[PDB]
Amino acid sequence: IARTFFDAPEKNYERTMAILQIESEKAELRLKELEVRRLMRAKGDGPWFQYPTIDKALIDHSPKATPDN
Amino acid sequence: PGIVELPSLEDLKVQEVKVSSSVLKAAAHHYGAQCDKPNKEFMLCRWEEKDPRRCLE
Numbered sequence: 001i002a003r004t005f006f007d008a009p010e011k012n013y014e015r016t017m018a019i020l021q022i023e024s025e026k027a028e029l030r031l032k033e034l035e036v037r038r039l040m041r042a043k044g045d046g047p048w049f050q051y052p053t054i055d056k057a058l059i060d061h062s063p064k065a066t067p068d069n
Numbered sequence: 070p071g072i073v074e075l076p077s078l079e080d081l082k083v084q085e086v087k088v089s090s091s092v093l094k095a096a097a098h099h100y101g102a103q104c105d106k107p108n109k110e111f112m113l114c115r116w117e118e119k120d121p122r123r124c125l126e
Contacts, residue, residue: 067116 076122 040046086093086115093100101108 029074063116067112067119068121 074122076125080125 036065041049044050080099111124115121
């Protein structure tokens, strides 16, 4: 029974070790995601949460009729 | 905010061109032909400085 069907205890042990390492890495990455989202929404100087402003290319740089501007 | 700087009347006292509209309109072409260089200097100063107080003289 142990030879034909059941897996070795070392195989299950190291498979469990790899699974635990992968899930611990995923949990740490999720916590880092929450922290970075909070910090960079609060500061607003990151690639995300960048609400758009007016583009500066639409300003006319030519002189006007009245120079007091 | 800051105090706005203004020149006094002593920098604003000059002789005036006390003439009507048609008096200026009749000789306006010779006006633009003869006294052109000081006019160009004054309005280039006005257009680049964008401040009367730096162009008065």
